[PDB]
UniProtKB/Swiss-Prot annotation:
The keyword Ubl conjugation applies. It comes from Homo sapiens (Human). Belongs to the ubiquitin-conjugating enzyme family. UFC1 subfamily. This is Ubiquitin-fold modifier-conjugating enzyme 1. GO terms for biological process: brain development; protein K69-linked ufmylation; protein ufmylation; regulation of type II interferon production; response to endoplasmic reticulum stress; reticulophagy. Keywords: Disease variant, Isopeptide bond, Ubl conjugation, Ubl conjugation pathway.
């Protein structure tokens, strides 16, 4: 299928995850977090080699709340957006909801709180890969393509302005 190949192309070279554990699952959750950090750092390293170093993420000590920044280049200007998400108790079966709080407020493909709205193909894709996909895959298959539609649209519509210096 086209969908299978497109997924393979994007998540090529991102380490797969193993453990089906969420925030309440003690030693198994600690192990899941090692897999999450190992996948994220390899994805970042790959992105640097691709000249597409487009995000940073940090977590709290328990790994249940994540926050950082993403960058998007449009007509050679770089745009920065703060991002954040909580880990659902039923992670990794359930995907986290990424918020871009500065874009909160009646914009296409978003919910209240600035939660990004992904297309319907993302949720079944995630479901059929549990528990192999993690936060690196959420960024690569979720937020990444979202930005490539929504940021150009919001710049064209004069919603987003670049800050001089």
């Amino acid at each position: 299928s086209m969908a299978d190949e497109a997924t393979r192309r994007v998540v090529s070279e991102i380490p797969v995850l193993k453990t089906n554990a969420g925030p309440r699952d003690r030693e198994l959750w600690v192990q899941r977090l090692k897999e999450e950090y190992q996948s994220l750092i390899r994805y970042v390293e790959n992105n640097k080699n691709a000249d597409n170093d487009w995000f940073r993420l940090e977590s709290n000590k328990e790994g249940t709340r994540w926050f950082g920044k993403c960058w998007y280049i449009h007509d050679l200007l770089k745009y920065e957006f703060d991002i954040e998400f909580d880990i659902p108790i039923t992670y990794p079966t359930t995907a986290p909801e990424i918020a871009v709080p500065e874009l909160d407020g009646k914009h296409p493909n978003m919910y209240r709180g600035g939660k990004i709205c992904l297309t319907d193909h993302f949720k079944p894709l995630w479901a059929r890969n549990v528990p192999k996909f993690g936060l690196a895959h959420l960024m690569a298959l979720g937020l990444g393509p979202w930005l490539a539609v929504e940021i150009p649209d919001l710049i064209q519509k004069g919603v987003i302005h670049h800050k001089e210096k």
